[PDB]
């Protein structure tokens, strides 16, 4: 709701294509097969 009107200096928009079910596994702090070799979110990931 407040993401419309919250000031952030930069937004890292990372675009790619993966398998369907693995999207929910991309969460701040979540670990898995992709969180160790391809792309891991930071432990303070504030985004979408």
């Amino acid at each position, epitope marked *: 709701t407040k993401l419309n009107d919250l000031c952030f200096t930069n937004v890292y928009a990372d675009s790619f294509v993966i398998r369907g079910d693995e999207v929910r596994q991309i969460a701040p702090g979540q*670990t*898995g097969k992709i969180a160790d070799y391809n792309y891991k979110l930071p432990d303070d990931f504030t985004g979408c």
Partner: antibody
Amino acid sequence: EVQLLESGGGLVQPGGSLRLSCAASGVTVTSNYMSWVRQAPGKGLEWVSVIYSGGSTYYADSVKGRFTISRHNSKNTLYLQMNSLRAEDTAVYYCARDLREAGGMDVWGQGTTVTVSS
Amino acid sequence: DIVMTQSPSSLSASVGDRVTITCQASQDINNYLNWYQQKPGKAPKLLIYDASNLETGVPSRFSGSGSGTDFTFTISSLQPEDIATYYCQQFDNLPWTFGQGTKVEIR
């Protein structure tokens, strides 16, 4: 050279804590995925728990808190403690390393039999 | 969540007979299917990967086919070395529910 051995287990009394040791050489424990699997005598496979790279431990719901995991880099070995083992957990245990999506878990380790019978 | 059960549960044949195994999943799986040989007592051994390429040691009589949810496995000539249980599972979504397992024993 690459070699995977295991230690731990016996005929201790029920409610007696134990510590399995998985000594692997030739690979990197820190940056590899690994799992623990127990197998009943004369039965099929039965997965237990997973450890990822970077300190992330997970299990099944029935074994939610079973393990206390630690590693030693002097010989690149794993130590894994269970407090007050359970009776029907009498089985042969294996520490395994899976290559996942480039050929999955071809060769197995040794596996040690642990009996916690009364 | 996802439970993956083998279409065949208990198949018994003799030496040299064809063996047909269907490996289905709850929904479509891809590149996460392996054909193993555990065998009684001895350590499990993976034999066939990706269902298309033969590995060193596996006889050419074994074949695999399929692109998608269902993968099929064919043994033209059953041999005494094939007394085993085939397990194909979904090692993607924890927890790993167990399948039925195709136990092939020769007569």
